[PDB]
Design a protein around this nucleic acid. Structure first.
Lengths: 245, 78, 103, 101, 89, 18, 95, 78, 104, 92
DNA sequence: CGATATCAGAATCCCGGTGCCGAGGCCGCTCAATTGGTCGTAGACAGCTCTAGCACCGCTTAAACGCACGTACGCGCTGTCCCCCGCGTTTTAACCGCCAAGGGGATTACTCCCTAGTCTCCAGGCA
DNA sequence: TGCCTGGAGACTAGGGAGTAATCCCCTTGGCGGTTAAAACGCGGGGGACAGCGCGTACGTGCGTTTAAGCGGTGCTAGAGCTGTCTACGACCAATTGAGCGGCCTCGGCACCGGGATTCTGATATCGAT
């Protein structure tokens, strides 16, 4: 049903039944690339002390860097110099390891994601891929796009000077909806000295169930938006009448 | 009164090297007290060695000797 | 040939002997003493550098910096006992994070 | 609409990260200039118009930080004792009293 | 004076291709001066306690068996004995 | 294929016998 | 009649701190010495004062260790000393 | 075997001199382990001093010297 | 022939201190003022400890100084206690000390 | 054979500070141990100071600095005073 | 029935009588501390050479500061359950006493071989 | 580039280290009695311990503000160390009284003894429910 092909198809600019009317991206792209990074100095040697199994793999071979892996507990992926080489299981973002998920329509609020098969807890779903904005263009993007009539806005505050924007291009995680009783959460993971956001299951998700996370949203614009999920204790309004940033 | 130059995050940093996960807000003054006592004891002896040499510049030897006298041998400056 | 060659040592038996005599350790010094002491100091130097070179190679490095000496000395229980009251400049410490601190 | 945030790091995650960061590196932790002023200050009480070798302050700092690290390690053991986690003055005072200072 | 050149020459036996930094050399230099003083000072005491007048190989040997831990002591004592054996030939 | 910052090595030069 | 728990303990503390006698029995300690020592040199003879000095040093060591272990148990808000307190006092003492 | 000769009452009396109000039943075997470790460390040195003089008899001075060597300077024997 | 101790006004043996300084191999040469000064300091610390030990003897109503009075001198005074913190005194016992949380 | 002891000097000082008081031989043995130990500590530091200054003679000043480095607190001031006072009388 | 108290009775500390052993004074003479003189050199002193240390300046920027705020932690309390304390009886070996063997530490005379001190050759290494 | 200092080669005087013999201090082993301590059992009091719920103070995060390092220019105190030479300490003989050893003597102390106060751990009047 997804049918990711380079030829764009017939849709009324909503990306709902055919994700190829607009343009889509498979990983996070940058606008103002920095030569002032953490990677070459700080993360260079902070690898886990997990002894590499040298002959026990694929059969009676336990996975390298499981929940005993300190880097995993610290929300850091092992670097290219991990002692386990390419057998490390804590290099999921780097390996493009995703979960089986589908994009469907459920409520008048918009499109969403569902798990295609059985998923245990603490299972990595998808990376929040998008355009990384600077201090100057974020405040320009926000004031210029409101008058372009965009229905949804996909700005996420990553750091004091890193803001992800999935508005023009984004992977399949741009569709995960807000839930007050979610089954996934947004975790900050550091990969090779780069900060990245990943979705992880918080409970047992049955085959064919909708995937949602707690949107830790704020309202930056002059306009007011409301949520229609209404599970059991839905707040409904973004941030009250606040004026932050 | 330059003891306040031993800042809260610097003290924290030393505690982190020491493997400390969480720190009480009173620790910063206890640590300033303990460090000032340690340095008082080391500097008084390094100065004693300096005066015995009739020198005025406290040498790295006067310090290594003071630390060795205190029972804490230091390698790298001798 | 020097006394070092007769002892099969790299260390300066001449200097050790001179320092034992000149350093007031006794009113006179036996000829076997500087040889035995030189061999001991050389041996501990080799044991220390063996372990520091290993620590460097275990980091895939080719040069022994102070940290490799600290890692070497602290990873062996006997050298750690001998040098347990010794601060090493630029040495740092072993990670050793306590289990009750990990989630 | 507006911006949203990845959730806040779970408490202790940055603490353990800073532990790894500052145990992995080998460098002086206290700001060198503030420390050099502290060392000069307490030296004034013992001899008027003193002067210092640059290497002497480097040595005093290496000694001070090696002392405070050995202190915080034993203090942390005191704080792990009593079935807790947070370092407190009672823990420093205990580590010193047991050590014999 | 420093033991630095002999430390560097010893390093090439155990690790022919590795180098050592100036600071690390300063550490090895301090370490050799320290253990030298620990053994020589202990040998001085051993002689004085026995009211002898000279530091013999026996005094060094005991100052070592006292100063060094159990397994390291046996190795050091073996290298000291072997060195005096070759030197007396 | 990947390497660390040389500044790490500049702060501590090799022993020179001369 | 019976004294209440710990009353005789506080009484014993006062009796044993106020005195200066050696608390370990001489013969058991002497044999302990002669059995540990036998493993460094065979059939070593001992001056009576050597055994006395070893006992003085061992008792001062254990008394000082207990004084520091007491503060360990007290620090844990306990009153009962436990192996974990000796092992802490030794780890901080450096052993 | 003679370490059991360090009786429960004797360990208790040492704890009492040490001001210990209450003692866990596990303290006795740990005190034995710690005492034996301490005495082994002192006797290994006192025997070393004895062997040096080639004497068959361990003197009070060899014990004092082994203790002074371990920083445990003992007064009352020399 | 006034002894050096007499000439210095000391009770301690400057002659013996000079012998030990020369034959203890502390240095190649020993100045004439070194044994005088050292003897005077040993004398001072001997007087200080005997001052406090005699006071403790009176506090225990004993005419003689036993090892306990030396222990109670050394452990009560902050400066002698710091000077001798690593020393064990034979037949000396310990200071009476019960932690506050233990008593009722 | 004749053995060295500080007994007569320890006793002379005792008879100066507490004339109507005595001292048992166990206590005398401790006093001997103390005088011998402190002697070796001061002479050991004076030796080390001579070695550091590259001097062959331990002078009254090496002893003075050794005593200052070794003694704590005000006790050091008193000891240095008594040393100077005795050296003053000995100089005349 | 409650909150804040009265007497038993085991421990303790006192004032006095006892004897025993070791602190203290004594006496001899070893042996080492003193005196007096001579001598070689350690280091006090005067003087010069310059390398390190101290000082002020300015930019840069990463660090520290101040404050937001959410939720994990340290804390106080409740309960229970278990093991430690206090005590009485039973078990045995630590300690005292006198004793004897003989080991082996301390002592001595003499030997000798080892090291210090000297003087001469020469080779590893500073810019 | 030369050459100089440090290190080794040979011999030397004499005194420290070592053997062989011996004495005889004091340690090891022995036995048996006395009586104190250790062992062994038990009841049940207080404490270790877990669990729970709570209030805040601690970290994690952010935006703002400073001064810590680079790096540089410039002064010059005083570290370093080279020569002079003289007050000093090492050494030795001749000398004598200080103080170690071995000897008594007697009073300071440890101890036994019976009573006075201490303390602890119950039992009981004004209270109140």
């Amino acid at each position: 049903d997804d049918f990711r092909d380079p030829q764009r198809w017939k849709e009324c600019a909503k990306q709902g039944k055919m994700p190829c009317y607009f343009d889509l991206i498979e990983e996070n792209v940058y606008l103002t690339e920095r030569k002032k990074n953490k990677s070459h100095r700080d993360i260079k040697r902070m690898q886990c002390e997990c002894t590499p199994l040298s002959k026990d793999e694929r059969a009676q071979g336990e996975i390298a860097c499981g929940e005993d892996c300190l880097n995993r507990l610290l929300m850091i992926e092992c670097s290219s110099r991990c002692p386990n080489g390419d057998y490390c299981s804590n290099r999921r973002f780097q390996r493009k390891q995703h979960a089986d998920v589908e994009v469907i329509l459920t409520e008048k609020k918009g499109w969403g994601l569902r798990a295609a098969k059985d998923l245990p807890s603490n299972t990595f779903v998808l990376e929040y891929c998008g355009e990384v904005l600077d201090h100057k263009e974020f405040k320009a993007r926000v004031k210029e796009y409101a008058r372009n009539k965009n229905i949804h806005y996909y700005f996420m505050a990553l750091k004091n000077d890193e803001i992800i924007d999935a508005t023009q291009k984004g992977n399949c995680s741009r569709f995960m909806n807000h839930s007050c009783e979610p089954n996934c959460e947004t975790q900050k993971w550091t990969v090779n000295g780069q900060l990245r956001v990943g979705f992880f299951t918080t409970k047992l998700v049955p085959s064919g169930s909708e995937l949602t996370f707690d949107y830790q949203f704020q309202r930056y614009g002059k306009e007011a938006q409301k949520c229609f999920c209404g599970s059991a204790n839905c707040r409904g309004y973004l941030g009250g009448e606040n004026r932050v940033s | 009164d330059n003891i306040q130059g031993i800042t809260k995050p610097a003290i924290r940093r030393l505690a982190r090297r020491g493997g400390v996960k969480r720190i009480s807000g009173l620790i910063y003054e206890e640590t300033r007290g303990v460090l000032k006592v340690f340095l008082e004891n080391v500097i008084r002896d390094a100065v004693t060695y300096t005066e015995h040499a009739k020198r005025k510049t406290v040498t790295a030897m006067d310090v290594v000797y003071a630390l060795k006298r205190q029972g804490r041998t230091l390698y790298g400056f001798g | 040939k020097t006394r070092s060659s007769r002892a099969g040592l790299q260390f300066p038996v001449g200097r050790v002997h001179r320092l034992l005599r000149k350093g007031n350790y006794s009113e006179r010094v036996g000829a076997g003493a500087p040889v035995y002491l030189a061999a001991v100091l050389e041996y501990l130097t080799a044991e220390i550098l063996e372990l520091a070179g290993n620590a460097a190679r275990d980091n895939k490095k080719t040069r022994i910096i102070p940290r490799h000496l600290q890692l070497a000395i602290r990873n062996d229980e006997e050298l750690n006992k001998l040098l347990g009251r010794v601060t090493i400049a630029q040495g740092g410490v072993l990670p050793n994070i306590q289990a009750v601190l990990l989630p | 609409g507006g911006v949203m945030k990845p959730h806040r790091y779970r408490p202790g995650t940055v603490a353990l990260r800073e532990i790894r960061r500052y145990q992995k590196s080998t460098e002086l932790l206290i700001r060198k200039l503030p420390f050099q002023r502290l060392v000069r200050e307490i030296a004034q009480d013992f001899k008027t118009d003193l002067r210092f070798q640059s290497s002497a302050v480097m040595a005093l700092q290496e000694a001070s930080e090696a002392y405070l690290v050995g202190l915080f390690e034993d203090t942390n053991l005191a704080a792990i004792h009593a079935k807790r986690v947070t370092i407190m003055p009672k823990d420093i005072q205990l580590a010193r009293r047991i050590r014999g200072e | 004076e420093s033991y630095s050149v002999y430390v560097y020459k010893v390093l090439k036996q155990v690790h022919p291709d590795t180098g050592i930094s100036s600071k690390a050399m300063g550490i090895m230099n301090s370490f050799v001066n320290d253990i030298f003083e620990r053994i020589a000072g202990e040998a001085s005491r051993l002689a004085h306690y026995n009211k002898r007048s000279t530091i013999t190989s026996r005094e060094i040997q005991t100052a070592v068996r006292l100063l060094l831990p159990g397994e390291l002591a046996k190795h050091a004592v073996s290298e000291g004995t072997k060195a005096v054996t070759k030197y007396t030939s | 294929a990947e390497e660390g910052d040389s500044e790490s090595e500049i702060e501590d030069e090799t022993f020179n016998p001369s």
